[PDB]
Coordinates of C-alpha atoms (C1' of nucleotides) and ligand atoms in Angstrom, one line a residue:
Chain A
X254 CA 41.2 -0.8 -62.2
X255 CA 38.9 -2.1 -59.4
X256 CA 40.4 -4.4 -56.9
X257 CA 39.1 -6.0 -53.7
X258 CA 41.8 -6.9 -51.2
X259 CA 44.2 -6.6 -54.1
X260 CA 42.4 -9.2 -56.2
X261 CA 40.8 -8.2 -59.6
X262 CA 37.4 -9.4 -60.6
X263 CA 38.4 -12.6 -62.5
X264 CA 40.6 -14.1 -59.7
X265 CA 37.8 -13.0 -57.3
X266 CA 35.3 -15.0 -59.3
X267 CA 37.8 -17.9 -59.4
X268 CA 37.9 -17.8 -55.6
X269 CA 36.0 -20.5 -53.7
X270 CA 33.7 -20.1 -50.7
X271 CA 36.3 -20.8 -48.0
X272 CA 38.8 -18.4 -49.6
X273 CA 36.3 -15.7 -49.9
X274 CA 35.2 -16.2 -46.3
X275 CA 38.8 -15.8 -45.3
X276 CA 39.2 -12.7 -47.5
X277 CA 36.1 -10.9 -46.2
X278 CA 35.9 -8.7 -43.0
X279 CA 34.8 -9.9 -39.6
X280 CA 31.1 -9.2 -39.6
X281 CA 30.6 -10.7 -43.1
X282 CA 32.7 -13.7 -42.2
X283 CA 30.6 -14.2 -39.0
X284 CA 27.5 -14.0 -41.1
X285 CA 28.8 -16.6 -43.5
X286 CA 29.8 -18.9 -40.7
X287 CA 26.4 -18.7 -39.0
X288 CA 24.5 -19.2 -42.3
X289 CA 26.7 -22.2 -43.3
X290 CA 24.0 -24.9 -42.4
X291 CA 21.1 -22.7 -43.4
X292 CA 19.6 -22.8 -46.9
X293 CA 20.6 -19.8 -49.0
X294 CA 17.9 -17.4 -50.1
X295 CA 16.2 -18.0 -53.4
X296 CA 17.3 -14.4 -54.4
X297 CA 20.7 -15.8 -55.3
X298 CA 19.3 -18.2 -57.9
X299 CA 16.9 -15.6 -59.1
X300 CA 19.8 -13.3 -59.8
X301 CA 21.7 -16.2 -61.4
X302 CA 18.7 -16.7 -63.8
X303 CA 18.5 -13.0 -64.5
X304 CA 22.2 -12.9 -65.3
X305 CA 22.0 -15.9 -67.6
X306 CA 18.9 -14.6 -69.4
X307 CA 20.4 -11.3 -70.6
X308 CA 22.3 -10.9 -73.9
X309 CA 25.8 -9.4 -73.9
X310 CA 25.5 -5.6 -74.2
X311 CA 22.6 -4.7 -71.9
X312 CA 21.7 -4.9 -68.2
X313 CA 19.9 -7.9 -66.6
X314 CA 16.4 -7.3 -65.3
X315 CA 16.0 -6.2 -61.7
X316 CA 15.1 -8.6 -59.0
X317 CA 13.0 -7.3 -56.1
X318 CA 13.7 -8.5 -52.5
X319 CA 13.0 -7.6 -48.9
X320 CA 16.3 -9.0 -47.7
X321 CA 19.0 -6.6 -46.5
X322 CA 21.5 -8.8 -44.6
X323 CA 22.9 -10.6 -47.6
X324 CA 26.7 -10.4 -48.1
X325 CA 27.6 -9.4 -51.7
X326 CA 29.7 -12.1 -53.3
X327 CA 31.8 -11.5 -56.5
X328 CA 29.3 -13.6 -58.5
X329 CA 26.5 -11.2 -57.6
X330 CA 28.4 -8.3 -59.4
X331 CA 26.5 -7.1 -62.4
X332 CA 23.1 -8.1 -61.2
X333 CA 20.4 -5.5 -60.6
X334 CA 18.6 -5.8 -57.2
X335 CA 15.6 -3.7 -56.2
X336 CA 15.8 -3.6 -52.4
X337 CA 12.7 -2.8 -50.3
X338 CA 13.2 0.2 -48.1
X339 CA 9.8 -0.1 -46.4
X340 CA 7.4 1.1 -49.0
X341 CA 9.2 0.9 -52.4
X342 CA 11.8 -1.2 -54.2
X343 CA 14.9 0.8 -55.2
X344 CA 16.9 -0.7 -58.1
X345 CA 20.7 -0.7 -57.6
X346 CA 23.4 -2.1 -59.8
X347 CA 25.8 -4.4 -57.9
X348 CA 29.3 -3.1 -58.7
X349 CA 32.6 -4.6 -57.7
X350 CA 33.1 -1.9 -55.0
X351 CA 30.0 -3.3 -53.3
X352 CA 31.7 -6.7 -52.6
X353 CA 31.7 -7.7 -48.9
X354 CA 28.8 -5.3 -47.9
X355 CA 25.2 -6.0 -47.1
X356 CA 22.4 -5.4 -49.5
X357 CA 20.8 -3.1 -47.0
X358 CA 23.6 -0.6 -47.2
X359 CA 22.4 0.7 -50.6
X360 CA 18.6 1.3 -50.2
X361 CA 18.2 4.4 -48.0
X362 CA 15.0 3.9 -45.9
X363 CA 14.7 7.6 -44.8
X364 CA 15.1 10.9 -46.5
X365 CA 17.7 13.5 -45.3
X366 CA 16.5 16.6 -43.6
Chain B
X1104 CA -5.3 -24.3 -37.0
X1105 CA -8.8 -24.8 -35.6
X1106 CA -9.5 -27.8 -37.9
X1107 CA -10.3 -30.4 -35.3
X1108 CA -9.8 -34.0 -36.5
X1109 CA -12.7 -36.2 -35.4
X1110 CA -10.6 -38.6 -33.3
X1111 CA -9.2 -35.7 -31.3
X1112 CA -12.7 -34.4 -30.7
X1113 CA -13.8 -37.9 -29.6
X1114 CA -10.8 -38.2 -27.2
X1115 CA -11.5 -34.8 -25.7
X1116 CA -15.2 -35.6 -25.2
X1117 CA -14.4 -38.9 -23.6
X1118 CA -12.0 -37.3 -21.2
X1119 CA -14.5 -34.5 -20.5
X1120 CA -17.2 -37.1 -19.6
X1121 CA -14.9 -39.3 -17.5
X1122 CA -13.3 -36.4 -15.6
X1123 CA -16.3 -34.0 -15.2
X1124 CA -14.1 -31.0 -15.7
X1125 CA -11.3 -29.9 -18.1
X1126 CA -8.6 -27.3 -17.3
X1127 CA -6.6 -25.7 -20.1
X1128 CA -4.1 -22.9 -20.2
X1129 CA -5.1 -20.1 -22.5
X1130 CA -2.3 -19.9 -25.0
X1131 CA -2.7 -19.9 -28.7
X1132 CA 0.6 -21.8 -28.9
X1133 CA 0.6 -24.9 -26.8
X1134 CA -0.4 -28.5 -26.3
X1135 CA -3.0 -29.9 -23.9
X1136 CA -2.4 -33.4 -22.5
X1137 CA -5.0 -35.7 -21.0
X1138 CA -5.1 -39.3 -19.7
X1139 CA -7.6 -41.8 -21.1
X1140 CA -7.4 -45.3 -19.6
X1141 CA -3.7 -44.9 -18.9
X1142 CA -1.1 -43.5 -21.4
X1143 CA -1.8 -40.0 -22.7
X1144 CA -3.1 -38.0 -25.7
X1145 CA -2.2 -34.5 -26.8
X1146 CA -4.4 -32.1 -28.8
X1147 CA -3.4 -28.4 -29.5
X1148 CA -4.8 -26.0 -27.0
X1149 CA -6.4 -24.0 -29.9
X1150 CA -8.5 -27.0 -30.8
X1151 CA -9.6 -27.5 -27.2
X1152 CA -10.5 -23.8 -27.1
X1153 CA -12.5 -24.2 -30.3
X1154 CA -14.4 -27.3 -29.0
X1155 CA -15.2 -25.7 -25.7
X1156 CA -16.3 -22.5 -27.4
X1157 CA -18.8 -24.5 -29.5
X1158 CA -20.0 -26.4 -26.4
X1159 CA -20.4 -23.1 -24.4
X1160 CA -22.4 -21.5 -27.2
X1161 CA -24.7 -24.5 -27.1
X1162 CA -25.3 -24.1 -23.3
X1163 CA -23.7 -27.5 -22.5
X1164 CA -20.8 -26.4 -20.3
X1165 CA -20.1 -23.9 -17.5
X1166 CA -17.0 -21.8 -18.0
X1167 CA -14.6 -20.1 -15.5
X1168 CA -11.3 -18.3 -16.1
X1169 CA -8.5 -17.3 -13.7
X1170 CA -4.7 -16.8 -14.3
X1171 CA -4.4 -17.8 -17.9
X1172 CA -6.4 -21.0 -17.3
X1173 CA -9.9 -22.1 -18.4
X1174 CA -12.1 -24.4 -16.3
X1175 CA -14.9 -26.1 -18.2
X1176 CA -17.5 -28.1 -16.4
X1177 CA -20.2 -30.3 -18.0
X1178 CA -23.7 -29.5 -16.8
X1179 CA -26.7 -31.8 -16.9
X1180 CA -27.7 -31.2 -20.5
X1181 CA -24.0 -31.3 -21.4
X1182 CA -23.8 -34.7 -19.7
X1183 CA -26.8 -36.0 -21.6
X1184 CA -25.3 -34.7 -24.9
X1185 CA -22.0 -36.4 -24.1
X1186 CA -23.8 -39.6 -23.3
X1187 CA -25.7 -39.5 -26.6
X1188 CA -22.6 -38.5 -28.6
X1189 CA -20.3 -41.4 -27.4
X1190 CA -23.3 -43.8 -27.1
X1191 CA -22.4 -44.6 -23.5
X1192 CA -24.7 -46.7 -21.3
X1193 CA -27.4 -44.8 -19.4
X1194 CA -25.5 -45.8 -16.2
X1195 CA -22.4 -44.1 -17.4
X1196 CA -21.5 -41.3 -14.9
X1197 CA -18.7 -38.8 -14.5
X1198 CA -16.2 -39.3 -11.7
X1199 CA -17.4 -36.2 -9.9
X1200 CA -20.9 -37.8 -9.9
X1201 CA -19.9 -41.4 -9.0
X1202 CA -19.9 -41.8 -5.2
Chain C
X583 CA 26.9 -43.2 15.0
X584 CA 25.2 -41.5 12.1
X585 CA 23.9 -37.9 12.0
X586 CA 20.4 -36.9 10.7
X587 CA 19.8 -33.2 10.0
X588 CA 16.3 -31.6 10.0
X589 CA 16.1 -28.4 8.0
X590 CA 13.1 -26.3 9.1
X591 CA 12.3 -23.4 6.9
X592 CA 9.2 -21.1 6.8
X593 CA 8.1 -17.5 6.2
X594 CA 6.2 -17.3 9.5
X595 CA 8.6 -16.8 12.4
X596 CA 6.1 -18.0 15.0
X597 CA 5.3 -21.2 13.1
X598 CA 9.0 -22.0 12.5
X599 CA 9.8 -21.4 16.1
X600 CA 6.9 -23.5 17.3
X601 CA 7.9 -26.4 15.0
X602 CA 11.5 -26.2 16.1
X603 CA 10.5 -26.2 19.8
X604 CA 8.2 -29.2 19.3
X605 CA 11.0 -31.1 17.6
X606 CA 13.4 -30.2 20.4
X607 CA 11.0 -31.5 23.0
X608 CA 10.2 -34.7 21.1
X609 CA 13.9 -35.4 20.7
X610 CA 14.6 -34.7 24.4
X611 CA 11.9 -37.3 25.2
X612 CA 13.8 -39.8 23.1
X613 CA 17.1 -39.3 25.1
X614 CA 19.1 -38.7 21.9
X615 CA 22.1 -36.3 21.4
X616 CA 21.1 -33.0 19.8
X617 CA 23.2 -30.5 18.0
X618 CA 21.4 -27.1 17.7
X619 CA 19.0 -25.8 16.9
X620 CA 21.0 -23.3 14.8
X621 CA 19.2 -20.1 13.7
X622 CA 20.5 -19.7 10.2
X623 CA 20.7 -16.2 8.7
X624 CA 17.3 -14.7 7.9
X625 CA 16.9 -13.8 4.2
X626 CA 14.8 -10.9 3.0
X627 CA 13.2 -10.9 -0.4
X628 CA 12.7 -7.3 -1.7
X629 CA 10.5 -6.2 -4.5
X630 CA 10.3 -2.4 -5.0
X631 CA 7.7 -1.3 -7.5
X632 CA 6.2 2.1 -8.4
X633 CA 2.9 2.6 -6.6
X634 CA 1.0 4.1 -9.5
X635 CA -0.5 2.2 -12.3
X636 CA 0.3 4.2 -15.5
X637 CA 2.9 6.9 -14.9
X638 CA 1.4 10.0 -13.4
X639 CA 2.5 12.0 -10.4
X640 CA 5.4 12.0 -7.9
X641 CA 7.4 8.8 -8.5
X642 CA 6.5 7.0 -5.2
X643 CA 7.5 3.4 -4.5
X644 CA 6.3 0.4 -2.6
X645 CA 8.9 -1.7 -0.8
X646 CA 7.5 -5.3 -0.4
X647 CA 9.6 -7.5 1.9
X648 CA 9.4 -11.3 2.4
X649 CA 11.5 -12.8 5.2
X650 CA 12.5 -16.5 5.3
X651 CA 13.6 -18.2 8.5
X652 CA 15.6 -21.4 8.5
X653 CA 16.6 -23.7 11.4
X654 CA 18.6 -26.9 11.4
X655 CA 18.8 -29.6 14.1
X656 CA 21.2 -32.6 14.1
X657 CA 20.0 -35.9 15.6
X658 CA 22.3 -38.8 16.5
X659 CA 19.5 -41.3 15.9
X660 CA 18.6 -43.9 13.3
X661 CA 16.3 -43.0 10.4
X662 CA 13.4 -44.8 12.0
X663 CA 13.8 -42.8 15.2
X664 CA 14.0 -39.5 13.3
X665 CA 10.9 -40.5 11.3
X666 CA 9.1 -41.1 14.6
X667 CA 10.2 -37.7 16.0
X668 CA 8.9 -35.8 13.0
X669 CA 5.5 -37.6 13.0
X670 CA 3.2 -34.9 14.4
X671 CA 0.7 -32.4 13.1
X672 CA 3.0 -29.7 11.7
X673 CA 2.0 -26.0 11.5
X674 CA 0.9 -24.9 8.1
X675 CA 3.5 -23.1 6.0
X676 CA 6.5 -24.9 7.7
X677 CA 8.7 -27.1 5.5
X678 CA 10.7 -29.8 7.3
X679 CA 13.3 -31.6 5.3
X680 CA 15.3 -34.6 6.5
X681 CA 18.9 -35.2 5.3
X682 CA 21.6 -37.7 6.3
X683 CA 25.1 -36.2 6.7
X684 CA 28.4 -37.9 5.8
Chain D
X536 CA 2.6 -22.9 -46.5
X537 CA 0.6 -20.6 -44.2
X538 CA 0.6 -23.1 -41.3
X539 CA 4.4 -22.9 -41.2
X540 CA 4.4 -19.1 -41.5
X541 CA 1.7 -18.6 -38.8
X542 CA 3.3 -17.4 -35.6
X543 CA 6.8 -18.5 -36.8
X544 CA 8.5 -15.5 -35.0
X545 CA 6.6 -16.4 -31.8
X546 CA 8.0 -19.9 -32.2
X547 CA 11.5 -18.6 -31.4
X548 CA 10.3 -17.5 -28.0
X549 CA 12.9 -14.7 -27.5
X550 CA 12.5 -11.2 -26.3
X551 CA 9.8 -9.2 -24.5
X552 CA 7.2 -10.7 -26.7
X553 CA 7.6 -14.3 -25.5
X554 CA 6.9 -13.7 -21.8
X555 CA 3.7 -12.5 -20.3
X556 CA 2.2 -11.9 -16.8
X557 CA 1.1 -15.2 -15.3
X558 CA -2.1 -13.4 -14.1
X559 CA -3.1 -11.1 -16.9
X560 CA -1.0 -12.1 -20.0
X561 CA 0.2 -8.6 -20.4
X562 CA 3.8 -8.2 -21.7
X563 CA 4.6 -4.8 -20.1
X564 CA 6.4 -4.1 -16.8
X565 CA 7.1 -7.7 -16.0
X566 CA 8.9 -8.7 -12.8
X567 CA 11.3 -11.5 -13.4
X568 CA 12.9 -11.5 -10.0
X569 CA 12.7 -14.9 -8.2
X570 CA 10.9 -16.0 -11.4
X571 CA 7.7 -14.3 -10.4
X572 CA 6.7 -13.3 -13.9
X573 CA 4.0 -10.9 -12.7
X574 CA 3.4 -7.4 -14.0
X575 CA 4.0 -4.7 -11.5
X576 CA 0.3 -3.7 -11.3
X577 CA -0.9 -7.3 -10.7
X578 CA 2.0 -7.7 -8.3
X579 CA 0.8 -4.7 -6.3
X580 CA -2.7 -6.2 -6.3
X581 CA -1.6 -9.7 -5.3
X582 CA 1.6 -9.2 -3.2
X583 CA -0.1 -9.8 0.2
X584 CA -1.4 -13.2 -1.0
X585 CA 2.0 -14.1 -2.5
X586 CA 3.5 -13.5 0.9
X587 CA 5.1 -10.0 0.7
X588 CA 4.3 -7.2 3.1
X589 CA 4.7 -3.4 3.1
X590 CA 7.3 -2.6 5.7
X591 CA 9.9 0.1 6.0
Chain E
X1240 CA -7.1 2.0 -53.4
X1241 CA -5.9 -1.4 -54.7
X1242 CA -3.3 -1.3 -57.5
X1243 CA -3.2 -5.1 -57.8
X1244 CA -6.3 -7.1 -58.9
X1245 CA -8.0 -9.1 -56.1
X1246 CA -6.9 -12.6 -55.6
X1247 CA -9.9 -14.8 -56.5
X1248 CA -11.7 -17.1 -54.0
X1249 CA -10.0 -20.5 -54.1
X1250 CA -12.0 -23.3 -55.6
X1251 CA -10.9 -26.9 -55.7
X1252 CA -11.1 -28.7 -59.1
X1253 CA -13.6 -31.5 -58.3
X1254 CA -13.9 -34.3 -60.8
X1255 CA -16.7 -36.9 -60.4
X1256 CA -15.7 -40.5 -59.6
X1257 CA -11.9 -40.0 -59.4
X1258 CA -11.5 -43.3 -57.6
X1259 CA -11.8 -45.3 -60.7
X1260 CA -9.1 -43.3 -62.5
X1261 CA -6.4 -45.0 -60.5
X1262 CA -7.6 -48.5 -61.2
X1263 CA -7.3 -49.9 -64.8
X1264 CA -9.9 -52.6 -65.1
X1265 CA -10.7 -59.0 -63.5
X1266 CA -6.9 -58.4 -62.8
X1267 CA -7.0 -54.9 -61.4
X1268 CA -3.8 -52.9 -60.8
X1269 CA -3.1 -49.3 -59.8
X1270 CA -1.9 -46.9 -62.5
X1271 CA 1.0 -45.6 -60.3
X1272 CA 2.5 -47.0 -57.1
Chain F
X208 CA -31.8 -55.5 -46.0
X209 CA -32.6 -55.9 -42.3
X210 CA -29.5 -57.1 -40.3
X211 CA -27.2 -54.8 -42.2
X212 CA -29.3 -52.0 -40.9
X213 CA -28.0 -53.0 -37.4
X214 CA -24.5 -53.9 -38.5
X215 CA -23.8 -50.5 -40.0
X216 CA -25.3 -48.6 -37.0
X217 CA -23.2 -50.7 -34.6
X218 CA -20.1 -50.0 -36.7
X219 CA -20.8 -46.3 -36.6
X220 CA -19.5 -46.3 -33.0
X221 CA -15.7 -46.2 -32.7
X222 CA -15.6 -44.8 -36.3
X223 CA -15.7 -48.3 -37.9
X224 CA -18.0 -47.1 -40.8
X225 CA -16.3 -45.8 -43.9
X226 CA -18.4 -44.1 -46.6
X227 CA -17.9 -42.7 -50.1
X228 CA -16.3 -44.3 -53.2
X229 CA -12.8 -43.0 -52.7
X230 CA -12.6 -43.9 -49.0
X231 CA -14.1 -47.4 -49.5
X232 CA -11.7 -48.1 -52.4
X233 CA -8.8 -46.8 -50.3
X234 CA -9.8 -49.3 -47.6
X235 CA -10.2 -52.1 -50.1
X236 CA -6.9 -51.6 -51.9
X237 CA -4.9 -51.2 -48.7
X238 CA -6.8 -53.9 -46.7
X239 CA -7.7 -53.2 -43.0
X240 CA -11.4 -53.6 -44.0
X241 CA -13.7 -56.5 -43.1
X242 CA -16.5 -56.0 -45.7
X243 CA -18.1 -53.6 -48.0
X244 CA -21.8 -53.0 -48.9
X245 CA -22.8 -51.9 -52.4
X246 CA -26.2 -50.6 -53.5
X247 CA -26.9 -51.7 -57.1
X248 CA -28.5 -48.5 -58.3
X249 CA -25.1 -46.6 -58.4
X250 CA -25.8 -45.2 -61.9
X251 CA -22.2 -46.0 -62.9
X252 CA -21.3 -49.4 -64.2
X253 CA -17.6 -48.6 -63.5
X254 CA -18.5 -47.7 -59.9
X255 CA -20.0 -51.1 -59.1
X256 CA -17.5 -53.0 -61.2
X257 CA -14.5 -51.5 -59.4
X258 CA -16.1 -51.8 -56.0
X259 CA -16.7 -55.5 -56.5
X260 CA -13.2 -56.0 -58.1
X261 CA -11.3 -54.3 -55.2
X262 CA -13.0 -56.6 -52.7
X263 CA -12.5 -59.6 -55.0
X264 CA -8.8 -59.0 -55.2
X265 CA -8.5 -58.7 -51.5
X266 CA -11.1 -61.5 -51.0
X267 CA -13.4 -59.1 -49.1
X268 CA -17.1 -59.7 -48.7
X269 CA -19.8 -57.9 -50.6
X270 CA -23.6 -57.4 -49.8
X271 CA -25.9 -56.0 -52.4
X272 CA -28.6 -53.4 -51.5
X273 CA -31.8 -52.9 -53.5
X274 CA -32.2 -49.2 -52.6
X275 CA -29.4 -46.6 -52.6
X276 CA -31.6 -44.1 -50.8
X277 CA -32.4 -46.6 -47.9
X278 CA -28.7 -47.4 -47.4
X279 CA -27.8 -43.7 -47.4
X280 CA -30.5 -43.1 -44.8
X281 CA -29.1 -46.0 -42.8
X282 CA -25.6 -44.7 -42.5
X283 CA -26.9 -41.2 -41.5
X284 CA -26.1 -39.1 -44.6
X285 CA -29.4 -37.2 -44.2
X286 CA -30.2 -33.5 -43.7
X287 CA -32.7 -32.7 -40.9
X288 CA -34.8 -29.6 -40.5
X289 CA -36.9 -34.4 -38.1
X290 CA -37.1 -34.0 -41.9
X291 CA -35.3 -37.1 -42.9
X292 CA -37.2 -37.1 -46.2
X293 CA -36.1 -33.5 -46.9
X294 CA -32.8 -34.5 -48.4
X295 CA -30.7 -37.7 -48.4
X296 CA -27.1 -37.5 -49.5
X297 CA -26.5 -40.3 -52.0
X298 CA -24.4 -43.2 -50.6
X299 CA -23.8 -46.1 -53.0
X300 CA -21.0 -47.7 -51.0
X301 CA -20.5 -48.5 -47.3
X302 CA -17.4 -50.3 -46.0
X303 CA -16.9 -51.6 -42.4
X304 CA -13.6 -51.9 -40.7
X305 CA -14.7 -52.3 -37.1
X306 CA -17.8 -54.3 -36.4
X307 CA -18.4 -52.7 -33.0
Chain G
rG610 C1' 9.2 3.6 -21.8
rG611 C1' 17.6 1.1 -21.7
rA612 C1' 12.0 -0.5 -28.6
rA613 C1' 17.2 -4.7 -34.0
rC614 C1' 12.7 -8.9 -34.8
rU615 C1' 8.9 -9.6 -30.9
rU616 C1' 7.2 -5.7 -27.8
rU617 C1' 4.1 -2.0 -31.2
rA618 C1' -0.1 0.7 -30.4
rC619 C1' 2.7 3.9 -36.6
rC620 C1' 3.8 3.2 -42.2
rA621 C1' 4.0 -0.1 -47.0
rG622 C1' 2.4 -4.8 -48.2
rA623 C1' 0.8 -10.1 -47.8
rU624 C1' -1.7 -14.0 -44.9
rC625 C1' -5.3 -16.4 -41.3
rC626 C1' -10.4 -16.5 -39.0
rG627 C1' -9.1 -16.6 -33.7
rG628 C1' -17.3 -14.9 -37.6
rA629 C1' -19.2 -19.4 -31.6
rC630 C1' -24.3 -20.5 -32.5
rA631 C1' -29.0 -20.7 -35.2
rG632 C1' -32.0 -20.9 -39.8
rG633 C1' -31.5 -22.1 -45.3
rA634 C1' -28.2 -23.8 -50.2
rU635 C1' -24.5 -27.6 -51.7
rG636 C1' -22.8 -32.1 -50.1
rA637 C1' -19.7 -39.7 -49.3
rG638 C1' -21.8 -39.8 -56.9
rG639 C1' -17.6 -36.0 -51.7
rA640 C1' -19.0 -30.3 -47.6
rU641 C1' -14.1 -29.4 -47.3
rU642 C1' -8.6 -29.6 -45.4
rG643 C1' -3.5 -29.6 -46.8
rA644 C1' 0.1 -29.7 -50.7
rC645 C1' 4.8 -31.9 -55.2
rA646 C1' 6.4 -29.3 -59.8
rG647 C1' 6.2 -24.8 -63.0
rA648 C1' 4.5 -19.0 -62.1
rU649 C1' 2.4 -15.0 -59.2
rU650 C1' 5.3 -13.1 -55.4
rG651 C1' 9.5 -9.9 -51.0
rA652 C1' 8.8 -15.0 -50.0
rG653 C1' 12.2 -23.3 -53.1
rU654 C1' 4.9 -18.2 -49.2
rG655 C1' -1.1 -24.0 -52.7
rU656 C1' -1.5 -16.3 -51.2
rU657 C1' -3.8 -17.3 -55.9
rC658 C1' -3.3 -20.0 -60.7
rU659 C1' -2.0 -24.5 -64.2
rU660 C1' -1.7 -29.6 -63.6
rU661 C1' -1.9 -33.4 -60.4
rC662 C1' -2.7 -35.6 -55.8
rU663 C1' -4.4 -35.9 -50.3
rC664 C1' -8.0 -35.6 -46.3
rG665 C1' -12.7 -36.2 -44.7
rA666 C1' -18.3 -34.0 -42.7
rU667 C1' -14.2 -31.2 -38.3
rU668 C1' -15.4 -27.2 -42.8
rC669 C1' -16.8 -24.1 -46.2
rC670 C1' -21.7 -19.6 -48.9
rC671 C1' -25.4 -16.4 -46.9
rU672 C1' -28.6 -14.0 -43.5
rG673 C1' -29.1 -12.6 -38.7
rA674 C1' -25.8 -12.8 -34.9
rA675 C1' -21.1 -13.4 -32.4
rU676 C1' -16.1 -12.5 -31.2
rG677 C1' -11.7 -9.9 -30.6
rG678 C1' -9.5 -5.0 -30.5
rU679 C1' -2.6 -1.0 -26.7
rG680 C1' -10.5 1.6 -31.2
rG681 C1' -12.9 6.4 -28.9
rU682 C1' -14.8 8.8 -24.6
rG683 C1' -10.6 9.2 -17.8
rC684 C1' -15.9 15.1 -19.2
rA685 C1' -20.0 8.0 -18.5
rU686 C1' -17.3 4.6 -14.5
rG687 C1' -14.6 0.9 -11.0
rG688 C1' -9.8 0.1 -8.8
rC689 C1' -5.4 2.3 -7.9
rC690 C1' -2.3 6.5 -7.8
rG691 C1' -0.8 11.7 -7.5
Ligands
MG1938 MG1 5.7 -6.2 -37.2
MG1939 MG1 -10.7 12.5 -13.9
MG1940 MG1 -10.2 8.0 -12.0

RNA sequence: GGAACUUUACCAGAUCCGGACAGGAUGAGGAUUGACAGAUUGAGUGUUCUUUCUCGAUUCCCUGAAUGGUGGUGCAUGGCCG
């Protein structure tokens, strides 16, 4: 049902780094290009550990982070990330519809009037 | 870091005794360079500031400040303390005192 | 022969004119061909700041100006002769630069 | 790892926070023209010595 | 109010001697490198 | 027990003196040391044995000292109030890299 | 005073000492400094911890002090400005 740029989840996971960079929009691709030589955040491997520790049938434990400018990759789908909004960590589930967006687009820092 | 390694303190004291004054820009981030018998040596400005703060509290140097720069000058008791610290000869004299 | 250019610049008009006149006289004593002096365009450095510290009251401004005068003289003389001509007590605040033209 | 973290953002040396008045080390109302790097209040205090004058 | 417990003052584990632990004693060698 | 009282003091200048078991052993294993001085009343057989053996492997000299307290007072490991008898920090080993 | 970070003075957290000096305690048989790996954590941040190293009398603890502060008071002032 869910597709990103016409690709379902499994071929999206099969996609490599260069293909995903070419498949993503301009700001995300620029972010990936400028972070190419920089070491990736430890949050990625923390999420990988959390994903590999959960049994099939229930949700992986949430990982808390201050980072907001991380591009959501297809492998991050299914992980639970608690993003800091300034004074609390707000747990969100990474869905396929979130691919290509930043983490900071899902933790609202302010409250509406 | 204000942890001053002993050789850095010895070099600073030797330059302070040779050239009777020391001028250092007041920036937490930065390096101070001095000349001892040719060549150079570099110690962080924070460590020079710490050493001169200790010397000032012990009434051994006179201090002046203008336009982000310190100016420390060894007085008579400071000169005697420097001479005893580096075990220089009693005839050892700063450049500003040598004719 | 070869041309030597003296560039005389200063922020004091009287000092720059005095140095230029002295160089002119010294060169005339040496019987050398002279081009100039050329009075180059005067440049004005402008800094316009608010007069008040803080930000209270009518927004009044200060206009600080600094004017720079430059002169150039060309001497058809060897480098030794030009060095002789410029060897005198120069007025303070006057910068004299020597350049060989092609 | 605190020695690496200490003043790591000031290491970059970009923005208003990396430049201060060469007289008073204040980071507000700096004058960058002609690479003066003097705050406007200190500039008003020192302009005559620097060489500027109040005309017009 | 502090929800977390206070981080304790850092003490260094000091063992006496500690310079003879490296040397196995004669024909003396170093335990590692 | 007389001339070493001048040798150690002269070597104090230019940071030629090295004190403590760990630092003296670090000198002895990695050379760059001219001699070491050991006070016999070190209270540890392993201490004196290793200190002698490290010099022996490197063929470094060794001078015995009858009193640990006197040697400690020599190198300057003493707390003053001129109360040098108030407290003397134990110093069983002294190694010299630069003679002066 | 067109503030993404810095600036920044505010909020939620986490560090460092940038507490000089003096008098006491410990202390080369080591005062202390800095860290690999695992975990604590927002942090492949020795922040703290386990377990191992490394420096070296520079430092730590503890009392008086001291210092810094875009802390207060512009109705205590200077200078400047309106
Ligand atoms: Mg901030
Ligand atoms: Mg008033
Ligand atoms: Mg007033």
